[PDB]
Design a protein around this ligand. Sequence first.
Ligand SMILES: Cc1cc2nc3c(=O)[nH]c(=O)nc-3n(C[C@H](O)[C@H](O)[C@H](O)COP(=O)(O)O)c2cc1C
Ligand SMILES: Cc1cc2nc3c(=O)[nH]c(=O)nc-3n(C[C@H](O)[C@H](O)[C@H](O)COP(=O)(O)O)c2cc1C
Lengths: 108, 110
Amino acid sequence: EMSVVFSDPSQPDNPIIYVSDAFLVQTGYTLEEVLGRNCRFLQGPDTNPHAVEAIRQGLKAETRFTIDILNYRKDGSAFVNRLRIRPIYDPEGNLMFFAGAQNPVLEH
Amino acid sequence: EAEMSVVFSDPSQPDNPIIYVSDAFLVQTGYTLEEVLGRNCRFLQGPDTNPHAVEAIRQGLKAETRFTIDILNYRKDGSAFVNRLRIRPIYDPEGNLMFFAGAQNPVLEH
Ligand SMILES: Cc1cc2nc3c(=O)[nH]c(=O)nc-3n(C[C@H](O)[C@H](O)[C@H](O)COP(=O)(O)O)c2cc1C
Ligand SMILES: Cc1cc2nc3c(=O)[nH]c(=O)nc-3n(C[C@H](O)[C@H](O)[C@H](O)COP(=O)(O)O)c2cc1C
C-alpha cells in the first residue's frame, strides 16, 4: 500500500512535515517517530548508495524524480520502494514543499 | 495512442552508446539515425540543462535500477523541451544486465 510525505526544504535537511495515515501503517513507525525527521531513516544495509546520491541530486535539481530504492520497515523487513518525489510551488513560483510517495513494488 | 520515443544503450561498450532507436525518437528529436547510432544520448542536453539532473541520471545508471527524471533537453533545431526520461535496465533470460532502455516524453515546451 501507497503512502506519501511532505518535507519542508526551507528547514535544514528536509524534515518531514506531513505523513499520510498509510505511511504509518505500511512502515510501522508512529507519527511521533516520523514528524520532523528526514526520510532517510527508511534506508538500511542493502540500500544502494548510488540510488541515495541520485535522490540527493534530484532534490538539488528541484525536479520531479522517481527511483526504485530498497527501504526497510520498523520491523526490519525490506521492500523495493518505487519512490516518486515531486516539487510543490507556491503561487509566486517559490519551492514550498517536496512531496514523496512510497510505492512498495516488491518484497526483499 | 501517443508515439513512443525510446533508445536502448549497451553498457558493455564504452560510455553506454545507443544501439537501437525507435522511429518516434528520430521524429521527436529531429536527429537522423546516422547522427544518433553509437553515441551516448547526452547530446540531447544543452545550455540550461540542470547539472544536478545530469548527475542524478549518472547515479541512477550506476545503481542499475528503474528511474525517471524531468530534464531539459534540446531538439536538433535547438528548441527546448522538458523530457520526462524513463530509464530501466534490461536483463537477459539468465538475469544478467544486457541493455538500458531510455524513453523520452516531452512534457513542456520552452
Ligand atoms: C519528500 C521526501 C520523501 C522522501 N522519501 C524517501 C523514502 O521514502 N525512502 C528513501 O529512501 N528516501 C526518501 N527520501 C530521500 C532522503 O530524505 C534523502 O534526500 C536521501 O537519502 C538523499 O540525501 P542524503 O544523502 O543526505 O541521505 C525522501 C526525500 C524527500 C524530500
Ligand atoms: C538508455 C539511455 C537513454 C538516455 N536518454 C537520455 C535522454 O533522452 N536525455 C538526456 O538528457 N539523457 C539521456 N540519457 C543520459 C545520458 O546518456 C547520460 O547517462 C547522463 O548525461 C549522465 O551521464 P554523464 O554525467 O556522463 O553525462 C540516457 C541514458 C541511457 C542509458
